[PDB]
Amino acid sequence: SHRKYEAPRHGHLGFLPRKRAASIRARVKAFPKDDRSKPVALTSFLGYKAGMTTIVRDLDRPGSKFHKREVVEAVTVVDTPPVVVVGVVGYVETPRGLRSLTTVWAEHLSDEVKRRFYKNWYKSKKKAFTKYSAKYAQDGAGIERELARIKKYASVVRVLVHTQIRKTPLAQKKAHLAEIQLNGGSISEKVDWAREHFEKTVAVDSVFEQNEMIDAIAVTKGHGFEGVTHRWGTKKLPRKTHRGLRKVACIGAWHPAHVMWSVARAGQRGYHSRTSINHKIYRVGKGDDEANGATSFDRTKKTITPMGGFVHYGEIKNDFIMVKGCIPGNRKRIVTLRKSLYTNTSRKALEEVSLKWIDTASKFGKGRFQTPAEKHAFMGTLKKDL
Amino acid sequence: MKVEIDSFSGAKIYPGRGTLFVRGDSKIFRFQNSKSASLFKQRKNPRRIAWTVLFRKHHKKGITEEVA
Amino acid sequence: NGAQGTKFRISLGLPVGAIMNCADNSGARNLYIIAVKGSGSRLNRLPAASLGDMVMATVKKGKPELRKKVMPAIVVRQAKSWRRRDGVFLYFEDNAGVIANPKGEMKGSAITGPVGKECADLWPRVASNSGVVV
RNA sequence: GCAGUCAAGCGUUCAUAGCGACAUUGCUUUUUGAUUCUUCGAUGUCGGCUCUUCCUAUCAUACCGAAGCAGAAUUCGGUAAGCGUUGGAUUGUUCACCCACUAAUAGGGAACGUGAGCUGGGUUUAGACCGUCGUGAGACAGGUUAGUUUUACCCUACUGAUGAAUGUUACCGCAAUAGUAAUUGAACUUAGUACGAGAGGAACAGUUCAUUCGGAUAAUUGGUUUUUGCGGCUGUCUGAUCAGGCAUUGCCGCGAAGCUACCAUCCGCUGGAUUAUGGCUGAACGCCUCUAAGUCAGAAUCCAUGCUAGAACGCGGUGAUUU
RNA sequence: CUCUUAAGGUAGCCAAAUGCCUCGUCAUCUAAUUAGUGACGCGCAUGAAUGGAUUAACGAGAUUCCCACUGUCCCUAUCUA
RNA sequence: GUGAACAGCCUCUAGUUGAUAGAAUAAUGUAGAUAAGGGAAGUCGGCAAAAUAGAUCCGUAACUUCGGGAUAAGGAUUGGC
């Protein structure tokens, strides 16, 4: 009767059931609506969250006290090694949705996807697509037949992309595989983009640009079984309470004479698949630049990687986004950078960047330097020397 | 920008990477980290702290630069 | 009311029950916060003030003709480490405020101490009455 | 407790803008009663704390009508419970009054929700005191003070986690169904403009910010420290030295990694049908009429988009399928 | 002056562990106090060894305020066995 | 031995090493700790915890049964050679 002081619900009912996701790789539960007046391009890309660092830049938001002034914002890095296409896929339209028809593949599929489709590589015979692959020994009859059947049907089409994981310093010899839906017009152009890209790689450099908005789809960090307060921020009970205080007191009333779903019980915090949106890109670079840490304003030769290396990862020697701020999942985790489902009219999506400076310093310490050059310039001759 | 210097060590201070401390009158101090901040609060003496700029500049240690 | 603009978020450090030093020449020595002007509500959440926030407070140490009544006030210094977008984390050594009317005019004629930029930029009279700033 | 009806009269004039007497019809069960059907081989009987949900007879937020509405502010009313509905002083309190912020500080239900969840301040065991009553024992919805709060391992429910059987095994997917979450204010400009005799004093559009809520994240800042990582210090033992042990982690400074904070940071969508309401055409009724047909817009509404799970007996596709 | 019946509350003391009406009325403390303290008193029903009034020291007694102090709390977090 | 000291802490003599054990290291607990800024707003109630704490020196009110209050309060110092 009449909770004395009305206060608001703890936690979000929509993001239930806070259970473990079916896999580390997060599905894409919807895709950008197609504009059949463009070339075919992917609607997403795959990469690995790698960490963060501290970029500095200037603002261009009139209205601000910090207009035209420097700001120390936060950026997360995604290693986006170019991902290779090894299949396409059909989807016909039904009163039950986009039902599949074929999943067609290339020929010389790597050991990586062959590994994905096993669990015990070294003592298996490594025999996955042997016969579908020998079917290329002909002119490619059924290959092109189903290509044609998909040209006919397949109200939707998806290229199948596997990552070039052997690049990144990870010790996972297996490459994550997934679909990416195509949103040009011209179904012929769709499939032929696919086909010309069979066994070919693609990079974000062809899909994303500066000052553009993406969305991040991944799995939450794993925190195990965890209790009610921290899962829902529920108020800790006092010190005087018999039998624990990291609890909830009234888990329900007498009538309805059960316990409702609406109630904060202990359980699993983490390994949830989450979809964060409207994250603006700040820089899209490659492996060659020795001096990404050198910018328009910085010339000191130093790339994006900070001293000593990223923590828990190893070093970026491949393509990369630095995108704004917080992006679900922890380091080493697969991530999908999808692009949006609508236009920003924020002025904030569109306040572009002129980057100025980066910390390239050891996040494994309190780095006070940027280069070993600077390091020696600052201290100098060591009792070790020459 | 201006790479500030640590008021206790003179080590160099990029943006975000530390703190400012307004003394109660107006005297500013910049700190790279909670380390130098805690030393400052403990009221410790850099000219005796064996390892900062203001230590060796006092001590004529390894400058080897003023006679060039 | 009467503010010269808006306010960017700032780490909160002066809850209710707090006592800060008065940094004007009104004739006070302490300022005891009891409310805050914005102070959006919540269950068992104490109203908090921060640099440049107007509050209501009272005197515990000062004049007999000054204590024992409520008066609006304004914060000028705050030992609660906060952040400016330029990455400098900064904090004063103390916590300090001033007395005022609903419009943002002090009862004072000067200050004894440094001041916060946000309070200065948002409260022009306080800036005027300020000497050194930060 | 709340609502209606008729209309004497107030409301300068004027029954009905707002009110509303004499009367009268009702509703509810958030008051107290009346009854004693259940239960006295036992339902743990005050309040608060914490937590979820629900209702509308809506306090505010959204959209509208009306005015004794010029503007502002306000009052009456309609859709509407989607989102909110405070910090405190005294009190055991519910209640109550005050302070103050507020957009607002609405009423309530759930065995007068909530004691195998707490507390136990009060009430209500025995102890003790006072006053009055009583010859007296002792009494007193009279006052005061001290006074053990038991058990879940069972079923269910819930929250999370596995799982046989579907020819096997692996990979990519669909999406029935269920849930759903965003809210609120201020400043600048608007504009000192409209409006007004002036006093005063708006709104829309648009920009920047913020509160409440939520979901993630650790670059920075901060907090944490058995990295027992570096150093120092005390006491004592190892003959001294170095290097070491014990002091239930010996203490102190620092302290990465990791975990976490509105103590940090990032982010939090747009499309359709509708309410009231206002209108089109338009008779019924040869005029009129937003309606009877039909139709337009329109809300924090509903439903979609999107977001979460993925039916363990819903489904598809694809690959390998035993010297 | 007188009735009750024998006398008619003296000194002191109070909304007190005793005061219904009651959160008594005044002041003070306080932003705000049914708390506390100091005063008032036709006191339902104070009170003189059924002891009254007071009182230094002492009190694991009850109560109020103040300073320091703080995870009690705003608001949680983290570590160890 | 430290130290005022049979306190507490370590140790020689003597005696024990006996209280089911192994692997992990989730919530929740029990016990022990630390915490920004503020500082009882929490709470019936500052319950619990934190602060102080030895020794030397200075300084030490009200009230008083002149004995006390008093370690009052309140300040400074302390290491080793």
JSON list of C-alpha atoms in Angstrom, two decimals, chain A residues 59-206:
[
{"chain": "A", "resi": 59, "resn": "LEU", "atom": "CA", "xyz": [35.86, 22.23, -31.54]},
{"chain": "A", "resi": 60, "resn": "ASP", "atom": "CA", "xyz": [33.71, 23.87, -34.20]},
{"chain": "A", "resi": 61, "resn": "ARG", "atom": "CA", "xyz": [30.38, 24.16, -32.39]},
{"chain": "A", "resi": 62, "resn": "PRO", "atom": "CA", "xyz": [29.30, 27.80, -32.21]},
{"chain": "A", "resi": 63, "resn": "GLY", "atom": "CA", "xyz": [27.12, 28.12, -29.20]},
{"chain": "A", "resi": 64, "resn": "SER", "atom": "CA", "xyz": [29.91, 26.78, -27.02]},
{"chain": "A", "resi": 65, "resn": "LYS", "atom": "CA", "xyz": [32.08, 28.38, -24.43]},
{"chain": "A", "resi": 66, "resn": "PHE", "atom": "CA", "xyz": [34.59, 25.82, -25.73]},
{"chain": "A", "resi": 67, "resn": "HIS", "atom": "CA", "xyz": [33.91, 26.76, -29.34]},
{"chain": "A", "resi": 68, "resn": "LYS", "atom": "CA", "xyz": [37.09, 27.03, -31.39]},
{"chain": "A", "resi": 69, "resn": "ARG", "atom": "CA", "xyz": [39.05, 25.65, -28.43]},
{"chain": "A", "resi": 70, "resn": "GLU", "atom": "CA", "xyz": [40.96, 22.48, -27.79]},
{"chain": "A", "resi": 71, "resn": "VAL", "atom": "CA", "xyz": [39.28, 19.49, -26.17]},
{"chain": "A", "resi": 72, "resn": "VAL", "atom": "CA", "xyz": [40.79, 16.32, -24.78]},
{"chain": "A", "resi": 73, "resn": "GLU", "atom": "CA", "xyz": [38.34, 13.65, -25.90]},
{"chain": "A", "resi": 74, "resn": "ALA", "atom": "CA", "xyz": [38.43, 9.88, -25.74]},
{"chain": "A", "resi": 75, "resn": "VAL", "atom": "CA", "xyz": [38.79, 7.42, -28.57]},
{"chain": "A", "resi": 76, "resn": "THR", "atom": "CA", "xyz": [38.72, 3.67, -28.84]},
{"chain": "A", "resi": 77, "resn": "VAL", "atom": "CA", "xyz": [40.74, 1.84, -31.45]},
{"chain": "A", "resi": 78, "resn": "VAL", "atom": "CA", "xyz": [39.49, -0.94, -33.66]},
{"chain": "A", "resi": 79, "resn": "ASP", "atom": "CA", "xyz": [41.97, -3.04, -35.59]},
{"chain": "A", "resi": 80, "resn": "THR", "atom": "CA", "xyz": [40.26, -3.50, -38.92]},
{"chain": "A", "resi": 81, "resn": "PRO", "atom": "CA", "xyz": [42.54, -5.72, -40.93]},
{"chain": "A", "resi": 82, "resn": "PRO", "atom": "CA", "xyz": [41.08, -6.14, -44.39]},
{"chain": "A", "resi": 83, "resn": "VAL", "atom": "CA", "xyz": [38.53, -8.93, -44.41]},
{"chain": "A", "resi": 84, "resn": "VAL", "atom": "CA", "xyz": [38.18, -11.33, -47.32]},
{"chain": "A", "resi": 85, "resn": "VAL", "atom": "CA", "xyz": [34.98, -12.35, -49.02]},
{"chain": "A", "resi": 86, "resn": "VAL", "atom": "CA", "xyz": [34.49, -16.08, -49.45]},
{"chain": "A", "resi": 87, "resn": "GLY", "atom": "CA", "xyz": [30.78, -16.34, -50.03]},
{"chain": "A", "resi": 88, "resn": "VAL", "atom": "CA", "xyz": [27.48, -14.77, -50.82]},
{"chain": "A", "resi": 89, "resn": "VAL", "atom": "CA", "xyz": [24.01, -15.74, -49.70]},
{"chain": "A", "resi": 90, "resn": "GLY", "atom": "CA", "xyz": [20.39, -15.64, -50.77]},
{"chain": "A", "resi": 91, "resn": "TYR", "atom": "CA", "xyz": [17.24, -14.52, -49.00]},
{"chain": "A", "resi": 92, "resn": "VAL", "atom": "CA", "xyz": [13.78, -14.76, -50.47]},
{"chain": "A", "resi": 93, "resn": "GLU", "atom": "CA", "xyz": [10.83, -12.97, -49.00]},
{"chain": "A", "resi": 94, "resn": "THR", "atom": "CA", "xyz": [8.01, -14.81, -47.27]},
{"chain": "A", "resi": 95, "resn": "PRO", "atom": "CA", "xyz": [5.28, -14.16, -44.73]},
{"chain": "A", "resi": 96, "resn": "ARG", "atom": "CA", "xyz": [7.88, -15.68, -42.43]},
{"chain": "A", "resi": 97, "resn": "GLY", "atom": "CA", "xyz": [10.68, -13.37, -43.49]},
{"chain": "A", "resi": 98, "resn": "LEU", "atom": "CA", "xyz": [13.96, -13.53, -45.29]},
{"chain": "A", "resi": 99, "resn": "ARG", "atom": "CA", "xyz": [14.27, -17.27, -45.77]},
{"chain": "A", "resi": 100, "resn": "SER", "atom": "CA", "xyz": [17.56, -18.52, -47.12]},
{"chain": "A", "resi": 101, "resn": "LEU", "atom": "CA", "xyz": [18.24, -20.37, -50.37]},
{"chain": "A", "resi": 102, "resn": "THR", "atom": "CA", "xyz": [21.95, -20.87, -50.88]},
{"chain": "A", "resi": 103, "resn": "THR", "atom": "CA", "xyz": [25.23, -20.02, -49.27]},
{"chain": "A", "resi": 104, "resn": "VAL", "atom": "CA", "xyz": [27.68, -20.01, -52.16]},
{"chain": "A", "resi": 105, "resn": "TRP", "atom": "CA", "xyz": [31.42, -19.89, -51.64]},
{"chain": "A", "resi": 106, "resn": "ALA", "atom": "CA", "xyz": [34.74, -19.31, -53.36]},
{"chain": "A", "resi": 107, "resn": "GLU", "atom": "CA", "xyz": [37.42, -21.85, -54.18]},
{"chain": "A", "resi": 108, "resn": "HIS", "atom": "CA", "xyz": [40.72, -21.47, -52.35]},
{"chain": "A", "resi": 109, "resn": "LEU", "atom": "CA", "xyz": [39.29, -20.86, -48.92]},
{"chain": "A", "resi": 110, "resn": "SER", "atom": "CA", "xyz": [41.93, -20.42, -46.29]},
{"chain": "A", "resi": 111, "resn": "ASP", "atom": "CA", "xyz": [42.89, -22.70, -43.53]},
{"chain": "A", "resi": 112, "resn": "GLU", "atom": "CA", "xyz": [41.24, -20.09, -41.29]},
{"chain": "A", "resi": 113, "resn": "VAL", "atom": "CA", "xyz": [37.68, -20.64, -42.42]},
{"chain": "A", "resi": 114, "resn": "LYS", "atom": "CA", "xyz": [38.46, -24.32, -42.77]},
{"chain": "A", "resi": 115, "resn": "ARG", "atom": "CA", "xyz": [39.44, -24.11, -39.11]},
{"chain": "A", "resi": 116, "resn": "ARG", "atom": "CA", "xyz": [36.22, -22.31, -38.23]},
{"chain": "A", "resi": 117, "resn": "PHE", "atom": "CA", "xyz": [34.25, -25.16, -39.66]},
{"chain": "A", "resi": 118, "resn": "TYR", "atom": "CA", "xyz": [36.08, -27.61, -37.44]},
{"chain": "A", "resi": 119, "resn": "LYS", "atom": "CA", "xyz": [36.86, -27.91, -33.75]},
{"chain": "A", "resi": 120, "resn": "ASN", "atom": "CA", "xyz": [39.84, -30.28, -33.80]},
{"chain": "A", "resi": 121, "resn": "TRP", "atom": "CA", "xyz": [42.01, -29.18, -36.66]},
{"chain": "A", "resi": 122, "resn": "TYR", "atom": "CA", "xyz": [45.32, -30.90, -36.19]},
{"chain": "A", "resi": 123, "resn": "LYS", "atom": "CA", "xyz": [43.91, -34.43, -36.19]},
{"chain": "A", "resi": 124, "resn": "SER", "atom": "CA", "xyz": [41.06, -33.90, -38.59]},
{"chain": "A", "resi": 125, "resn": "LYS", "atom": "CA", "xyz": [41.77, -34.48, -42.26]},
{"chain": "A", "resi": 126, "resn": "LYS", "atom": "CA", "xyz": [41.06, -30.90, -43.33]},
{"chain": "A", "resi": 127, "resn": "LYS", "atom": "CA", "xyz": [38.34, -31.88, -45.77]},
{"chain": "A", "resi": 128, "resn": "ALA", "atom": "CA", "xyz": [35.56, -29.31, -45.54]},
{"chain": "A", "resi": 129, "resn": "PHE", "atom": "CA", "xyz": [34.64, -28.04, -49.01]},
{"chain": "A", "resi": 130, "resn": "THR", "atom": "CA", "xyz": [36.74, -30.48, -51.02]},
{"chain": "A", "resi": 131, "resn": "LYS", "atom": "CA", "xyz": [33.98, -31.37, -53.43]},
{"chain": "A", "resi": 132, "resn": "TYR", "atom": "CA", "xyz": [32.28, -28.00, -53.74]},
{"chain": "A", "resi": 133, "resn": "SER", "atom": "CA", "xyz": [35.80, -26.77, -54.52]},
{"chain": "A", "resi": 134, "resn": "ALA", "atom": "CA", "xyz": [36.53, -29.40, -57.14]},
{"chain": "A", "resi": 135, "resn": "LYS", "atom": "CA", "xyz": [33.30, -28.13, -58.71]},
{"chain": "A", "resi": 136, "resn": "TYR", "atom": "CA", "xyz": [35.38, -25.13, -59.78]},
{"chain": "A", "resi": 137, "resn": "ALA", "atom": "CA", "xyz": [37.54, -27.48, -61.85]},
{"chain": "A", "resi": 138, "resn": "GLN", "atom": "CA", "xyz": [34.78, -27.33, -64.46]},
{"chain": "A", "resi": 139, "resn": "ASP", "atom": "CA", "xyz": [33.79, -24.02, -66.06]},
{"chain": "A", "resi": 140, "resn": "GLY", "atom": "CA", "xyz": [31.96, -23.21, -62.81]},
{"chain": "A", "resi": 141, "resn": "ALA", "atom": "CA", "xyz": [28.61, -24.51, -63.97]},
{"chain": "A", "resi": 142, "resn": "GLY", "atom": "CA", "xyz": [26.61, -24.78, -60.75]},
{"chain": "A", "resi": 143, "resn": "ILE", "atom": "CA", "xyz": [28.59, -21.91, -59.30]},
{"chain": "A", "resi": 144, "resn": "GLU", "atom": "CA", "xyz": [27.20, -19.58, -61.95]},
{"chain": "A", "resi": 145, "resn": "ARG", "atom": "CA", "xyz": [23.87, -21.37, -61.96]},
{"chain": "A", "resi": 146, "resn": "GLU", "atom": "CA", "xyz": [23.20, -20.43, -58.37]},
{"chain": "A", "resi": 147, "resn": "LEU", "atom": "CA", "xyz": [24.71, -17.02, -58.96]},
{"chain": "A", "resi": 148, "resn": "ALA", "atom": "CA", "xyz": [22.00, -16.71, -61.60]},
{"chain": "A", "resi": 149, "resn": "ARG", "atom": "CA", "xyz": [19.33, -18.12, -59.35]},
{"chain": "A", "resi": 150, "resn": "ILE", "atom": "CA", "xyz": [20.24, -15.51, -56.75]},
{"chain": "A", "resi": 151, "resn": "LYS", "atom": "CA", "xyz": [20.27, -12.80, -59.40]},
{"chain": "A", "resi": 152, "resn": "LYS", "atom": "CA", "xyz": [16.70, -13.90, -60.03]},
{"chain": "A", "resi": 153, "resn": "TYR", "atom": "CA", "xyz": [15.54, -14.30, -56.45]},
{"chain": "A", "resi": 154, "resn": "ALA", "atom": "CA", "xyz": [17.13, -13.07, -53.26]},
{"chain": "A", "resi": 155, "resn": "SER", "atom": "CA", "xyz": [15.25, -9.90, -52.44]},
{"chain": "A", "resi": 156, "resn": "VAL", "atom": "CA", "xyz": [18.21, -9.53, -50.05]},
{"chain": "A", "resi": 157, "resn": "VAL", "atom": "CA", "xyz": [21.83, -10.52, -50.52]},
{"chain": "A", "resi": 158, "resn": "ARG", "atom": "CA", "xyz": [24.78, -10.87, -48.17]},
{"chain": "A", "resi": 159, "resn": "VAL", "atom": "CA", "xyz": [28.47, -11.29, -48.80]},
{"chain": "A", "resi": 160, "resn": "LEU", "atom": "CA", "xyz": [30.23, -13.62, -46.42]},
{"chain": "A", "resi": 161, "resn": "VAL", "atom": "CA", "xyz": [33.35, -12.21, -44.89]},
{"chain": "A", "resi": 162, "resn": "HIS", "atom": "CA", "xyz": [36.02, -13.86, -42.85]},
{"chain": "A", "resi": 163, "resn": "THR", "atom": "CA", "xyz": [38.66, -11.97, -40.99]},
{"chain": "A", "resi": 164, "resn": "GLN", "atom": "CA", "xyz": [42.37, -12.00, -41.74]},
{"chain": "A", "resi": 165, "resn": "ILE", "atom": "CA", "xyz": [43.10, -12.81, -38.13]},
{"chain": "A", "resi": 166, "resn": "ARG", "atom": "CA", "xyz": [46.63, -14.11, -38.68]},
{"chain": "A", "resi": 167, "resn": "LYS", "atom": "CA", "xyz": [47.66, -10.48, -39.00]},
{"chain": "A", "resi": 168, "resn": "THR", "atom": "CA", "xyz": [46.81, -9.22, -35.53]},
{"chain": "A", "resi": 169, "resn": "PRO", "atom": "CA", "xyz": [49.12, -10.47, -32.74]},
{"chain": "A", "resi": 170, "resn": "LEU", "atom": "CA", "xyz": [46.36, -12.67, -31.35]},
{"chain": "A", "resi": 171, "resn": "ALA", "atom": "CA", "xyz": [47.19, -16.33, -30.89]},
{"chain": "A", "resi": 172, "resn": "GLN", "atom": "CA", "xyz": [43.79, -17.38, -32.22]},
{"chain": "A", "resi": 173, "resn": "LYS", "atom": "CA", "xyz": [44.53, -19.20, -35.45]},
{"chain": "A", "resi": 174, "resn": "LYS", "atom": "CA", "xyz": [40.78, -19.12, -36.28]},
{"chain": "A", "resi": 175, "resn": "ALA", "atom": "CA", "xyz": [38.97, -16.41, -38.17]},
{"chain": "A", "resi": 176, "resn": "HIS", "atom": "CA", "xyz": [35.50, -15.22, -37.33]},
{"chain": "A", "resi": 177, "resn": "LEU", "atom": "CA", "xyz": [33.06, -15.38, -40.20]},
{"chain": "A", "resi": 178, "resn": "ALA", "atom": "CA", "xyz": [29.85, -13.56, -40.80]},
{"chain": "A", "resi": 179, "resn": "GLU", "atom": "CA", "xyz": [27.43, -11.98, -43.23]},
{"chain": "A", "resi": 180, "resn": "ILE", "atom": "CA", "xyz": [27.17, -8.40, -44.40]},
{"chain": "A", "resi": 181, "resn": "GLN", "atom": "CA", "xyz": [24.17, -7.26, -46.40]},
{"chain": "A", "resi": 182, "resn": "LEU", "atom": "CA", "xyz": [24.61, -5.22, -49.54]},
{"chain": "A", "resi": 183, "resn": "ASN", "atom": "CA", "xyz": [22.72, -2.00, -50.13]},
{"chain": "A", "resi": 184, "resn": "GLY", "atom": "CA", "xyz": [23.28, -0.86, -53.63]},
{"chain": "A", "resi": 185, "resn": "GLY", "atom": "CA", "xyz": [20.66, -1.26, -56.23]},
{"chain": "A", "resi": 186, "resn": "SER", "atom": "CA", "xyz": [21.46, -3.34, -59.27]},
{"chain": "A", "resi": 187, "resn": "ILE", "atom": "CA", "xyz": [21.33, -6.96, -58.07]},
{"chain": "A", "resi": 188, "resn": "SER", "atom": "CA", "xyz": [23.66, -7.82, -60.92]},
{"chain": "A", "resi": 189, "resn": "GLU", "atom": "CA", "xyz": [26.13, -5.28, -59.59]},
{"chain": "A", "resi": 190, "resn": "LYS", "atom": "CA", "xyz": [25.59, -6.71, -56.12]},
{"chain": "A", "resi": 191, "resn": "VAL", "atom": "CA", "xyz": [26.46, -10.25, -57.03]},
{"chain": "A", "resi": 192, "resn": "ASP", "atom": "CA", "xyz": [29.26, -9.26, -59.37]},
{"chain": "A", "resi": 193, "resn": "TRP", "atom": "CA", "xyz": [30.82, -7.06, -56.72]},
{"chain": "A", "resi": 194, "resn": "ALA", "atom": "CA", "xyz": [30.58, -10.13, -54.57]},
{"chain": "A", "resi": 195, "resn": "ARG", "atom": "CA", "xyz": [32.05, -12.37, -57.20]},
{"chain": "A", "resi": 196, "resn": "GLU", "atom": "CA", "xyz": [34.93, -10.13, -58.23]},
{"chain": "A", "resi": 197, "resn": "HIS", "atom": "CA", "xyz": [35.64, -9.82, -54.52]},
{"chain": "A", "resi": 198, "resn": "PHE", "atom": "CA", "xyz": [35.67, -13.59, -54.03]},
{"chain": "A", "resi": 199, "resn": "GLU", "atom": "CA", "xyz": [38.93, -14.42, -52.29]},
{"chain": "A", "resi": 200, "resn": "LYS", "atom": "CA", "xyz": [39.59, -10.66, -52.27]},
{"chain": "A", "resi": 201, "resn": "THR", "atom": "CA", "xyz": [39.89, -8.44, -49.27]},
{"chain": "A", "resi": 202, "resn": "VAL", "atom": "CA", "xyz": [38.10, -5.23, -48.41]},
{"chain": "A", "resi": 203, "resn": "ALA", "atom": "CA", "xyz": [38.97, -2.44, -45.99]},
{"chain": "A", "resi": 204, "resn": "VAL", "atom": "CA", "xyz": [37.11, 0.20, -44.05]},
{"chain": "A", "resi": 205, "resn": "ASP", "atom": "CA", "xyz": [39.01, 2.69, -46.20]},
{"chain": "A", "resi": 206, "resn": "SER", "atom": "CA", "xyz": [36.35, 1.92, -48.81]}
]
